[PDB]
Amino acid sequence: GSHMEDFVRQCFNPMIVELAEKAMKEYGEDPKIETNKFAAICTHLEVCFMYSDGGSKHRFEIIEGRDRIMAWTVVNSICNTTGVEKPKFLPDLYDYKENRFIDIGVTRREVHIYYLEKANKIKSEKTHIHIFSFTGEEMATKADYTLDEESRARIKTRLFTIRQEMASRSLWDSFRQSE
């Protein structure tokens, strides 16, 4: 029973905690032990949800948070109807306006180094990439940040609030050193 696990459950809403737990049990990981990964997945999930709320009513299809089979099912439907290439790795969203998959990144390090590793790993040069850092920087493919400035600023504010809440509980150091 770690301090980090209790902080996560009272900091993020229960629907996000539920999906993160279900996500971690696929791939076979324990939220009670891998506490920093538990906090990272909840954070990445909330950012994806906030991101999808930034566009118009039904601009974004949400891929993250679904079980692996259903997420791939929607990816197949999106590809077999828009003609967009099928990614090798599951993205996070699909932009019906810009007609591209998006993988959102949340990092505790430099947005520069994290971007390079993300593009190398997915090996899908057509999946748009957008990174957020806990300090307030962001990096997007082709410098195309998809959303307007106000939607991204809300995400950066929430990210800095999360880091403050862990720092005030002396859990930020172990979190930052966990990536």
Known catalytic residues are: 64, 92, 118
DSSP 3-state of 170: coil
Residue 23 touches which of Mn ion, ligand KU5, none (Cβ within 5-8 Å per kind): ligand KU5
Q: Enumerate residues 83-102 that contact Mn ion by CB under 5 A.
A: 92
Residues 6+ apart with CB under 8 A from 44: 64, 104, 106
104 in contact with Mn ion (CB under 5 A): yes
Output the smallest distance, CB 131 to Mn ion, in A. 9
Interface with Mn ion, residue 103, by CB under 5 A:
yes
**Alpha carbon distances (Å) from 155 to 26, 102, 129:** 27, 16, 16
**Cα(10)–Cα(117) distance, rounded to whole angstroms?**
32
Give the residue, chosen from 3, 70, 82, 89, that forms a contact with ligand KU5 under the rule CB under 6 A.
Answer: 89
**Taking the complex as a whole, how short is the minimal distance between the CB of residue 167 and Mn ion, in angstroms?**
24
d(CA 2, CA 38): 12
Interface residues with ligand KU5 (CB under 6 A)? Answer: 23-24, 27, 40-41, 44, 64, 89-90, 92, 103-105, 121-122
